[model samples]
Target: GPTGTGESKRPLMVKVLDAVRGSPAINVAVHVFRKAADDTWEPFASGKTSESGELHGLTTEEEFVEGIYKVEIDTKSYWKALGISPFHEHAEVVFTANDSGPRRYTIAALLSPYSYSTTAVVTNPKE
Candidate 1:
């Protein structure tokens, strides 16, 4: 049942955590970009993290084609409000998404001022 919100079977999702505070990073903003034929990133979607934040309905499954995507998380703006200096202007996760039996992904991130770790949890439909 981890397929999605149990409502929409969208292909992408994101989650952020603050390693320093050991809590959910609720104030961060995330942006999605799809690579163009010129290899440049084009804006695809955006979202802000909160207790109920997940980028649902960003793009239709039919529109989200198989291509390289950049899910850029705004860490620069997040740390300033918490009274800390940040190093990375933004944390970006570049990935390729291809349709595969209801292909879905959940991006999880453990973040800090100058350090971060990320992983993508791809959930596919059961046959």
Candidate 2:
């Protein structure tokens, strides 16, 4: 069983998978941003995906509050590296986080040279 306080303040875990290619997206740059009190999006964290399509330890330095957050991926560069032109230049995911919600969120994307789709979900149920 999972262990911990199941606190909502825990770090968010994001996993990206290449559903169309059926493989992990390696070296793809990912960025996370949070909406500020001034209504501007401020960068919270950024990193590249691992060979397993996971971004390790991505979360705002401060505890998450009830608000929207965005995750952007460098999809074009990833496709370009593989010698293909992607249908989309990039991908963005906007989701809301709150104290009552699960701590970990996983973002998944299905990518093809012609198109892409994404969805975010909580990996750990609130406990």
Using lDDT, give the best candidate's number.
1
- Tens-place lDDT per residue, model 1, 1-127, is 2222232456777888888988888868998899999989998888788774455565566667688899998988988889999998988899888754448778888888998899988887454
Q: Report model 1's TM-score to 2 decimal places.
A: 0.84
- lDDT score of residue 83 within candidate 2: 88
Looking at model 1, the pairs that clash are: none
The predictions' CA RMSDs to the true structure, in order, are 4.0, 4.5
Q: What range of 10 consecutive residues in model 1 has the weakest lDDT sum?
A: 1-10
**Residue 102 error for model 2, in Å?**
4.1
Best by TM-score: 1
Count of clashes in candidate 1: 0
Alpha carbon lDDT of each predicted model = 0.79, 0.74
Query: Tens-digit lDDT track for model 2 on 1-127?
Result: 2233232344566666676578988888998888998999998778898888887556532455567889888889999988887878788998888657545666777677777878767655445
Distance (Å) between predicted and true CA of 98, model 1?
A: 1.2
